[PDB]
Design a protein around this ligand. Sequence first.
Ligand code: ATP
Ligand code: CA
Lengths: 279, 398, 165, 329, 339
Amino acid sequence: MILLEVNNRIIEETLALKFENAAAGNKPEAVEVTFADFDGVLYHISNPNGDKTKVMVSISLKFYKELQAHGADELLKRVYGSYLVNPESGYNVSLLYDLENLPASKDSIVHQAGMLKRNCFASVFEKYFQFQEEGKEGEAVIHYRDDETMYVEKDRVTVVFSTVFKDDDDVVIGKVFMQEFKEGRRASHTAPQVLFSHREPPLELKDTDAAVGDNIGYITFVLFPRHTNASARDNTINLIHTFRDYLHYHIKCSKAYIHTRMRAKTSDFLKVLNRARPD
Amino acid sequence: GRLPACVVDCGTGYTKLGYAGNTEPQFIIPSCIAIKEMKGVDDLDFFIGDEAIEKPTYATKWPIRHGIVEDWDLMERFMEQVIFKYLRAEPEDHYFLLTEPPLNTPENREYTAEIMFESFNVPGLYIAVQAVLALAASWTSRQVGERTLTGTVIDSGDGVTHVIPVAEGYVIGSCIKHIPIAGRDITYFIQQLLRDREVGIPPEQSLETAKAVKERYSYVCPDLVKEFNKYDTDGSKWIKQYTGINAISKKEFSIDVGYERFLGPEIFFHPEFANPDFTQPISEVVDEVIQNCPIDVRRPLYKNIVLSGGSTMFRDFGRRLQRDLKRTVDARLKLSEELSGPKPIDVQVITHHMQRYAVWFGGSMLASTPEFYQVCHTKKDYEEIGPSICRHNPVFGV
Amino acid sequence: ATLRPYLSAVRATLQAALCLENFSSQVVERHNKPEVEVRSSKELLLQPVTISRNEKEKVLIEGSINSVRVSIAVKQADEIEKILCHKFMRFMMMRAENFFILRRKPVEGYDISFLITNFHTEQMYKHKLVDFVIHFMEEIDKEISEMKLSVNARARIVAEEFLKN
Amino acid sequence: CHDQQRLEVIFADLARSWALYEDEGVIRCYLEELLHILTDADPEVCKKMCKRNEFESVLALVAYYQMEHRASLRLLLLKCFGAMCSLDAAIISTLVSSVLPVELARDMQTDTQDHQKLCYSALILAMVFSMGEAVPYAHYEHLGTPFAQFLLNIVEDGLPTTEQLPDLCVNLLLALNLHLPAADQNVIMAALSKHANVKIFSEKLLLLLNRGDDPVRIFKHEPQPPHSVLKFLQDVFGSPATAAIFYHTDMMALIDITVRHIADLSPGDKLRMEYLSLMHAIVRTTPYLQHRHRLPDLQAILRRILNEEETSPQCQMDRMIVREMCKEF
Amino acid sequence: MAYHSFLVEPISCHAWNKDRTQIAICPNNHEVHIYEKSGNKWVQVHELKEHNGQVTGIDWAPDSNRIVTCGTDRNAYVWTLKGRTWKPTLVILRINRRCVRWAPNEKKFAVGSGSRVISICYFEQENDWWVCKHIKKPIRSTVLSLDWHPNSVLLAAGSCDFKCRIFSAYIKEVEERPAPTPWGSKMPFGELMFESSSSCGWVHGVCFSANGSRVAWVSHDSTVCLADADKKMAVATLASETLPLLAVTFITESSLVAAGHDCFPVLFTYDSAAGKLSFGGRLDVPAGLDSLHKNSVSQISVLSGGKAKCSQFCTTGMDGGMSIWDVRSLESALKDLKI
Ligand SMILES: Nc1ncnc2c1ncn2[C@@H]1O[C@H](COP(=O)(O)OP(=O)(O)OP(=O)(O)O)[C@@H](O)[C@H]1O
Ligand SMILES: [Ca+2]
């Protein structure tokens, strides 16, 4: 998979298994599992009050309050509705499922629930999109990671994420990928504009408690009305929410391929050395 | 700290991945990866798990051979997809505990450390022994009374079944014995038996059908005469029927499952059946393994006999094992007491609740403790000292 | 600046300092080690010679009666090439257990270091060894370039693919 | 003696078309016999037998290959053609003078459902055009700007296979442009000027350049042809419209490769003058003095090259070339 | 021109028997092997595993039929044949730290080592034990190669001190007095009679002539130096374009052959007239090597003929090949070679 998967495979497979077992009229088996997702998301699914008839799925994020401040409850109610229930103790957002009352179509519910984090983060993006659509200019900072902060802000829409590159080499690889993505307007002319900032954030994010350093990076994603439309909302959101993760995964992949090339070259050289011996 | 680390035991036939602390694995996939028959992102087009077993545009490759790694790059890509595609957890923001084979080389551990620390930049890394965590998983059958790191662990899988003596977390390599009969060999025995007994089964589904027979109806018997006489005289309550669907014609194919269900599971108690180059039974192997080790820990090794791996989940295996072992033991004791001009040798074969995946269970139980944060080699120590920092893993929990 | 006569003088000097022989320690009882590495006897250490084709890329040879230590600092064109060179030199250093003609750490002020022992000089052809060094240099250059191009290509592809979505 | 008789008998029976109306198995046996004979036996005998009666058996094999409709027989004929091309230069000129090239092109355009056949056709065409001695105007009617855009699309987009045909198509491209004419009369350059959206071909050509090895030179015959990569790069960087294929970063990368290959090259070689000329063309058509990068070390290297008073004629020619290309400002 | 492939590893020392019927060698091992010649093929006959390390020096007393050996084991073994088994006797070297050669008198052997002391050693029949007196005067480094003169009273040795000295290891309790030599009149145990003038290169090679008039040596500075006491101890050196030589021996009274890191046996002649050394050339003219041995020569003894007219030269190297040469075939091959 080149692009990062948006849906959580663990939750999807577990829910699919439970639904398949329930649709057969088999006995309700209890379920308990702790999972995690990118950018430090903490998922935990278990049966409430020991009742095998009820299955609760809890989700916890460090920036849940900042997300709820931008109207997350409304989007969650719009997406889940009856499925949405009182949050579990310590959790940020918990959904409930009754085995005694379910619908026929299982694929929709599973595909929707698997995109939990995506739907949780899509709130601000939807709000900004509607704001840009209305034309009300002159109007956000979410700390998705511990040492990172994503900043979102007439004719265009700017989304500058300020992430951190721990490894010294990863900064170089990321710099290469960003240098290629900036002039990426040669491949697809209809694509969004891409800007990169090495040590200091852009002019917009200036003196706003901006964390500057050699190990930090501010990537600016400049989208337009063509990509900010409601018709292509879900896809663009799915990509943008996974921009950072995809970047790090790609850089790491480059490190791996490099490891392979190094092993091969080592094999060739070692072969020359083995060919330098008598017998 | 706040989040949970990831645990991944790569077996020969099946890889078990998930989050530590969980009751079961978050994903138990197959030990196989899809590849091309090269530059760019050509290494990014790699599929692992069950979604690679039957690829047609790609080629299905196997990496973990007999517990040891054969091709490193492939295992690297597999761990990549296991981390990003299956687990999808931030590696820099999480630790990791990997499992090793009984005959895992030091240089191999070094290489694993290199691949995990340099490419993934993991915040924590810990390479554990399988039997060490296995005895710990067996310490989750017996409660608090006798939870010790002393005992003899027999790990049987798809690739290789081994008998390794464990003492206080430290294994005794000089006493470890290798066995030839593994899960794949019993599956194969079932395949041949089914191939010779009845027909009407597609060749493209023969192996899978055999595996199914080894899964659902396979059970070990006590005698080799009664399990056949009960099928010859009665055969109305014993002989089961198996129904499958031919992937080719999508038609309901049917077969009759019988004596094979006893024979396959019997292959362990008697290796002479399907191997001309092996005459030793498992009882003798365990006996020699317990005897060729330190005498002072022999009683402890004979006391805590822990079953680990999937090939040991078969019904009434440990019963027959303990039966033969205690039989030979009582015999030798009588022989020693007849020419004595001796105390009762206690022997117990433990059957854990998670004996199917004990290697991963023990790891999840070790990683859940606070000590696992103190014992695990830090990324700092890895970058400051070198790969040798992952060469020796401390054993705690006693 | 860059020529082939540099690796010819390098090959010649390598041929001249491949005249080592096995020698026991004169200080320690029944000990045997590389003379060039510990440098304990000033009587056995020859005058070390350095050869530079440029201000950035050069090769320093330090010979002895029972050892020959060759350090090689490769050319550094860009930052990426430097990080890659460091990574490859390190990766090769880790496998010093396999390469009995190389040492785990590079010489101070050099890119990589290989200690060709007298024992190593006795169980391998000198001519083949010199060939191994020359090939090591030319392969270092070519492989570095290829790795650079491949990496750049990968970055371009990933950027294009991410931009196309 | 027996091999020549078997080859002559096979050639005679195949020229009877009686072979086209015969069994596929017998024809397969005969083709395999001829191929094995051309592959395992003496070269002189095969050369004389193939060129016998002015390449009669060869021309007959070509016509029979043009009339046959069997894929496997076409593959075997392509292999045998590869061997015959590996035999000598005369058979290569004879086959290149035949319509075998055009038919191979048409078959390459028509049957896209045969991967192995297309590969063998690409390789055989690459070997046949690896000399570039003769250029029939009639062959330009089947293989030109259209086929060029097709192959360029095959390199840029790729097909839906082992993908070992992309590099083979690139090799065939380098071989075809080896016998091309200047930027004004070059079909490849015209196609390159048509669709300059191809970035992959640039990267592949770059990898081919950094490798140093030639993918066109497989056989070793007297009067060897020039370097394919250098000539192709010259034809591509012969005009701004054709040099427009290189990207912002890719141009600088290629500049680095050309400069490094120019500096590493010792005095006396042949490739140095060519790489110098390419460096001259890259600063002629492409915007070299735009970002003014990589020009410092290039200046130092050029100064060290012009101070090289070598008595040899090669270094003198190279010095004359750099003196010609010394547009300094 | 008769090279025999015996092993793959290098060779340490090469020794021969009295009638040259058997040959003895060590293969950088804790043991020493003795092989004979039965037909065209060679077969091993004896094996001695007394030493506790890599064997460095070994020499066989021909008339006495007794071979002494000393290496890294910091000990010496005066092996003598006892029935069907070669019994070894541990001759105490008395050294806190690579060369051994019997005298022409075959009564006492010199053991030059890294203890910076040429440890001469004679056999005391009064105590039935070997005693080793150490000559350390004016010695600063190890004794690479040691060779006797015909007097059997004066020994020559090259050191890592960039010089080849000719001292005296004469024990007056094992032999009679020594006659007056041209190398001096005063000959005492420990007295330095001669020395070199070189300040560079290690003296890996050293050998005296048959007449005892001239003593030659090979230095590791790609230079060979022969001295003649016939012309007031005159020293004549010569720089070889080839690599350094490892072993040096004289074929005639004015013609010597030597090999080394050049991996090719070379010939040379020194004219007494002008008083300078001259190069004869390459006697060994024909993996990828342009010579017989694929590595450097390590030792070169004489098979039969003496140092005045050698009829056959024996050459052992680091190539694992036994190089048997003949002066007749070499003179029949290279017509431009004057001996
Ligand atoms: N229900 C079952 N009962 C008994 N055996 C089974 C069952 N299911 C699978 N097996 C067998 O168990 C084998 C796999 O066991 P296991 O998972 O312990 O090995 P692994 O961990 O994949 O490989 P290794 O033991 O080399 O680490 C398979 O070959 C299969 O034949
Ligand atoms: Ca296992």
